[PDB]
Point group: C3
Chain length 366, copies 3
């Protein structure tokens, strides 16, 4: 043979031994994929159906403002990490009673970017977005900044809303009391009417308070929002609002309107990873070979067999660690790196044709 | 689904990573279970048959005193640890010529308690007890205190004897000459006649000397016992006894009686873990699935294949480490935590019905 | 049973845990056995066919001098270690056009001694020898001294040549620029005519220069050799030679004769471990079960599957580590520890009968 049928210091060989050394334990993990944890945004989809039927934009704004708060609400007492989705992992949930269907494909493992797309069962809204959790270690706590723009298209009103979820932080992680706190600044934009809803998730510095307002294009406060993201959210007149001025309730301003309050967790919550009645349904047979319900890493943990799922986590990570190396010589099956049509940021637009059962060449993640 | 089909800090997660980190090498081990090492008490069963036929209680006491010494005698030059019996492990030995049959089930792995029961082939005695070795590290040596009461029921005389084996110590273990020494205080009680036999296993401080006496209920020395537990044991008159007063023989007092002396080890001893002619028989097909002869950990080591048995030790320990966790959501098959009927201490009474071949639901240890 | 069917401190048990702790990574390795790396001596076999046809001994000496230089010439830019041959590993190469056939059996793993034997296709020469690489770590470099005597028997002239390859050194290995250098002193002896060819592989201290001379029995310089082992080798008159007097050409003395120059490496060299056009042929079905082409450790690395070959390296080393222990209760199949018939050193004489396809009881290395 003329040549070969294949091609090609100690410290340099050591920088490769350290870069390859990555693993993951399975105890801080909870029996849910991150695609399933993000699916909890649709827990209060009724606020979207309520928003698409109101003829007043500021009343639509209150519902979208309440929906954004209700989406990040179920993150209380749930100090369990979701399974980091393997490259190509997908998930779908069709709630017949709530009236929505959602797709979510793990579109990137480096960085761990997750893209999703949801649509109304009666063609009333379209909900999609992408989230990349940037984990920051600092002091005795750990932050997690959900990088990405959320998009809610109100179909029958020919409008769309965009905002950014606030930063989630896990306090006292070294040797203390784990309690989750969410803070940051959320701004919702009505791209048709020009209405902006500013929301200020206050920090422990008063613990889970959320204060904000809703204004128009001329920048005039129309409603004053207040409450706690672990309890409720109110909408009171702005004039009467300004006239009022593991750490451990809300003060109802006269003339307030209860936009939304938390649904009580089922009795099975305290001893089952503090799940909500909606979260315990995330996990028949026509599902694709990539749906995380088929992931034996998450599945084996759900049956109580701990050590069985821990090895299959190392197994599935090792296959993803090996198949990624063989591709140096990836195809996003349901999303394409397209710009967000309302704000311009590089989003992940839903390609389509997923609800057609005819598909082939889906990667073999597990 | 309403709920789930299964239920549920870093430093706290580290105390679990350290508590779970337990393993065991297989080189200090010797190809014998601890149930087999303890079976060597019956090596000199003839002293029991000799005891049940004598009409003099103090002559019966001398034999039981000699039997207790002969039981811990074979522990010389045998610096090899026996295989720690897995939970539920059993062993049985029926010597047709010696005239006894013995059962021993590993009744507890935490703490490592071993319970046994032996009976005479001609219905002349009943021998049972429980032993828990408490290992103490100190200085450049290692002790092992056999916690538990030995019980010898002389059937035809309607009497029973009870005593406690002395502490075994392994000197010079770090980087020195391993030599076994046994010291402590043993007291044998004749619960029918009130005779007490005190035995003082002297320590290296003279090396393996054993001095003692036999007295009645009125506390009067009847016989004076002396000798070495690695050699012999004599019974001389108490009056003429008091008139006489790897480290490296006995002085026969005038008027002495040789109660017992050691049997010479076979020539195959020096190059086969210093076993005795009785110990090399401990390891046909109607044996239960728990008999340690069926343990592949001990078995593979007996054939010379070292590395084969070392992995199966890790395998059998890992199965015991996994099956114990699945029971948090044990059944002693042949012993029940009953009090010793002669002294009152919490012993392990032999339940019975073992010699009936009909049995089911025996745990799958290997 | 009378006895057993098998025979037999912490710090002493630790000296065994450290002596057994040996492994090997597979990245510095290159997809070639050391038996194949040494086979590159025959890359310029034409110099041997040219030597056996010349009627002048000093012209034969120049060719053997040029052949010895050309043998260690292909070690440039090849900073990849060959696979350490397992005990009993063999290799054979029959180049029909070059006119030679060579056998090489890994005759010893401790120390790693490799023995080979080559013969001319037209019965013109016999080439054999043994090499043991003594690895020395020093400073920021690593040496490798090829211990062993090379033997070239010129058949039709009834003479034989013997010499020793120079020391190979790998500079700047810690965290620097890996570049190979060969230095030492090589002396070729014509045992029939008494001619001696001294070769001085100069060191970096001028980088790869090689200066030497050829003298007779009366110790008189007949030819003066100069050049670089990575370029060429010349033979000029000794009188006109003395009249001339990652670090980074030759000066052609008037009246010089080009004995040999390097063959240009194929274009596939730079991105395929810097192999030569001859080296890329070392790796149909009548080959014995020991030929390193059948070694899956070297084979799997040749197909590009890296991690597949890395485990099979640990596998094949573990089998060699286990089969060597079972022999304490080895047979060299093609060489016998016989003294070299020309200089007297303990060589490895080729037994014979290898080219007969009838053979049995070859060890199962993989
Ligand atoms: C302590 C370690 C080992 C495990 C716990 C880390 C967990 C609590 C971290 C890792 C990633 C984080 C999540 C990243 C993304 C979101 C989406 C956001 O809209 C709500 C918060 C939420 C859900 C974060 C909650 C906290 C989180 C789940
Ligand atoms: C050095 C380590 C790793 C291995 C050696 C430990 C061995 C020698 C220890 C561990 C448990 C100990 C045994 C525990 C129980 C008994 C029963 C008693 O009636 C005689 C002594 C005897 C038999 C002990 C002898 C010494 C012993 C076997
Ligand atoms: C850096 C480490 C991990 C791997 C690299 C070590 C390599 C370069 C070393 C190990 C053994 C050495 C070889 C030992 C034997 C010979 C035969 C001699 O006639 C030419 C040099 C040669 C071919 C040496 C070249 C350098 C060598 C191949």
């Amino acid at each position: 043979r003329t040549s070969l049928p294949s091609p090609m210091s100690i410290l340099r060989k050591c920088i490769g031994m350290e870069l390859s050394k990555i693993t993951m334990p399975v105890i801080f993990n909870e029996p849910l994929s991150f695609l399933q944890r993000l699916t909890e945004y649709m827990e209060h989809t009724y606020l979207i159906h309520k928003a698409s039927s109101l003829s007043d934009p500021v009343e639509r704004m209150q519902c979208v403002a309440a929906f954004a708060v209700s989406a990040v609400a179920s993150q209380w007492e749930r100090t369990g990490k979701p399974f980091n989705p393997l490259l190509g992992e997908t998930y779908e949930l069709v709630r017949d009673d709530l009236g929505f269907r959602l797709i979510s494909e793990q579109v990137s493992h480096h960085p761990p970017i997750s893209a999703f797309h949801a649509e109304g069962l009666n063609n009333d809204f379209i909900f999609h977005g992408s989230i990349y959790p940037k984990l920051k270690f600092w002091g005795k706590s750990v932050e997690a900044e959900p990088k990405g723009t959320i998009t809610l298209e109100l179909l029958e009103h020919n409008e769309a809303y965009t905002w950014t979820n606030p930063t989630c932080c896990v306090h006292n992680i070294i040797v203390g009391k784990l309690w989750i706190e969410q803070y940051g600044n959320v701004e919702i934009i009505n791209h048709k009417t020009g209405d902006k809803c500013v929301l200020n998730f206050k920090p422990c510095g008063e613990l889970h308070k959320v204060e904000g307002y809703i204004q128009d294009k001329s920048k005039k406060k129309l409603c004053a929002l207040y409450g706690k993201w672990t309890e409720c959210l109110y909408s009171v007149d702005p004039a009467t609002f300004d006239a009022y001025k593991v750490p451990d309730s809300v003060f109802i301003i006269p003339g307030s309107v209860l936009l939304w309050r938390i649904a009580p967790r089922p009795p099975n919550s305290a001893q089952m990873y503090n799940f909500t009645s909606f979260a315990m349904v995330l996990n028949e047979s026509v599902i694709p070979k990539t749906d995380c319900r088929l992931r034996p890493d998450i599945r084996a943990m759900e049956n109580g067999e701990i050590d069985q799922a821990s090895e299959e986590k190392k197994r599935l990570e090792e296959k993803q660690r090996a198949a990624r190396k063989n591709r140096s010589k990836w195809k996003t099956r349901w999303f394409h790196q397209g710009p967000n049509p309302y704000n311009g940021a590089q989003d992940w637009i839903y390609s389509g044709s997923y609800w057609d059962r005819n598909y082939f060449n889906l990667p073999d993640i597990y």
